[PDB]
Amino acid sequence: SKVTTVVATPGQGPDRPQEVSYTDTKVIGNGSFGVVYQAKLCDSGELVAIKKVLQDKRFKNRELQIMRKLDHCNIVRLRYFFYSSGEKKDEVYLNLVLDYVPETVYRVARHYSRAKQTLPVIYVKLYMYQLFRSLAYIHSFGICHRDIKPQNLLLDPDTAVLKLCDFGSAKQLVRGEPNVSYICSRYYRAPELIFGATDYTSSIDVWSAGCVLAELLLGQPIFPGDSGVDQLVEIIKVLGTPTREQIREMNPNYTEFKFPQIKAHPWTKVFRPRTPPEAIALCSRLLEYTPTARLTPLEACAHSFFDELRDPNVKLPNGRDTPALFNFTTQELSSNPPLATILIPPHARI
Ligand SMILES: Nc1ncc(-c2ccc(S(=O)(=O)N3CCOCC3)cc2)nc1C(=O)Nc1cccnc1
């Protein structure tokens, strides 16, 4: 193989297009947008990913907009973007150049699942905390990810750092304008979306995080619907039939045309016996029907499930130190600054 060179504007920086060179291209992903590659930067030999998408020449690309304005150690950094042409003869692709992170939460969880083992709760806390922190960041901008799932959580296995990726469904939600309801992967889809809501909040993402938490504890999806509609049934088999007032606050226009009566299944019986009670309790406040009842990502960060992460004696199981869990910015804390007293423990205050 050889060297490819392009002119790429830097991601969040100035609109100063520069020459970037890279080699060692290999496919690592795809979808409706196009293809994703791994590449090695010829300058630093740093691994990056390149998401290549077909851009309609005349409209703007909302993923690029969302990504140019994000800077967070639990999100994949847009290093550069650039344009290219080919395969479509006379048509243009937008190329996102992003941090490459080598593992995913789906693959870790799959690997313990195939071994009839459970991911140890220390990795559950580390992964879930970093997820919530990144949700607090994007939600402070009113950007909803709309695709929280284990496949979109990247991991460095040596540093235990997590990064959110795939902003292909991210939208900046304005109050007023509607949003499509058939969003998120089925398994992680919040119940108001299944009722066809169109003016939902960013709490759909928090729902999805609870699905991820619950899955990490169970070793399998908690709500495995076989269709977009039977998803709701799988939910009801755990949370019970939603009260009409709960259906009122998912979407007020009653597209509620289905289910029967099923008592809630006790939260303690749905998980395995040696499950931490703080885990269940955090789960129980994420997957609530009423969208305004779910914890915000910042409050879930403050949850007592993550007290071990606030201890001063905490090191990863491989002996190294935890990533930086407290370097909070004013933007992260904007939804509830007084949380800082819990989120930034004393042994880490300047
Ligand atoms: N920034 C990234 N950094 C790493 C990965 C990534 C990491 C590991 C794997 S992998 O474990 O399946 N294995 C690894 C090695 O070779 C075979 C595959 C696959 C992808 N993706 C992305 C990314 O942005 N993805 C994306 C974005 C938008 C839409 N759709 C996908």
Contact 218, 287 (CB under 8 A): no
Cα–Cα distance for residue pair 70/165, rounded to 1 Å = 12
Q: Is the CB of 168 under 6 A from ligand 1?
A: yes
- Nearest-CA neighbor of 93 among 41, 124, 53? 53
- The count of other CB atoms within 10 Å of the CB of residue 341 is 11
Q: Which residue has the tokens 């129980």?
A: 284
Contacts of the segment 238-246: beta carbons below 8 A, 24+ positions apart: 238/264, 238/265, 238/270, 239/264, 239/265, 239/287, 239/288, 239/289, 240/264, 240/265, 242/191, 242/289, 243/289, 246/289, 246/290
Give just the sign of the alpha carbon dihedral 71, 11, 168, 153.
negative
Tell how far the Cα of 236 is from the centroid of ligand 1, in angstroms.
Answer: 33
Annotated binding site: 28-36, 51
Q: Side by side, which strands form the sheet with 153-155? A: 103-104, 153-155, 162-164
Please tell me whether residue 109 adopts helix, strand or coil conformation.
Answer: helix
Mutate to test the pocket of ligand 1, among 27, 48, 98, 165 (most ligand atoms within 8 A of CB): 165
The 3-state secondary structure of 159-208, one letter per residue: CCCEEECCCCCCEECCCCCCCCCCCCCHHHCCHHHHCCCCCCCCHHHHHH
Cα–Cα distance for residue pair 323/126, rounded to 1 Å = 9
Domain ranges in the chain with CATH number 3.30.200.20: 6-102
Active site residue 147: yes
The CATH H-level (homologous superfamily) assignment of domain 6-102 is Phosphorylase Kinase; domain 1 (3.30.200.20)
Mutate to test the pocket of ligand 1, among 25, 36, 47, 52 (most ligand atoms within 8 A of CB): 36
Contact 84, 57 (CB under 8 A): no
> What are the tokens at 154?
């990247």
Q: Is the CB of 98 under 6 A from ligand 1?
A: yes
Tell how far the Cα of 215 is from the centroid of ligand 1, in angstroms.
Answer: 21
Domain ranges in the chain with CATH number 1.10.510.10: 103-350
Where does 103-350 sit in CATH, by number?
Answer: 1.10.510.10
Name the closest-CA residue to atom 13, ligand 1.
Answer: 28
Contact 223, 208 (CB under 8 A): no
Query: How far is Cα of residue 249 from the mean position of the Cα atoms in its chain?
Result: 24
- Nearest-CA neighbor of 203 among 217, 184, 218? 184
Q: Which residue has the tokens 């293809």?
A: 35
- Nearest-CA neighbor of 231 among 275, 184, 166, 168? 184
Q: Write the single-letter amino acid at 256.
A: E
143: enclosing H helix or E strand: strand 143-144
Tell how far the Cα of 123 is from the centroid of ligand 1, in angstroms.
Answer: 20
Q: What is the DSSP pairing of strand 3-10 with strand 18-30? A: antiparallel
Resolution of this model in Å is: 2.5
Give the ligand 1 atom nearest the CA of 29.
31
Identify the DSSP state of 264. Answer: P
- Nearest-CA neighbor of 27 among 1, 3, 51, 55? 51
Give the ligand 1 atom nearest the CA of 76.
1
Strand runs (DSSP E) across 165-313, as ranges? 171-172
> What are the tokens at 247?
């259906």
Please tell me whether residue 145 adopts helix, strand or coil conformation.
Answer: coil
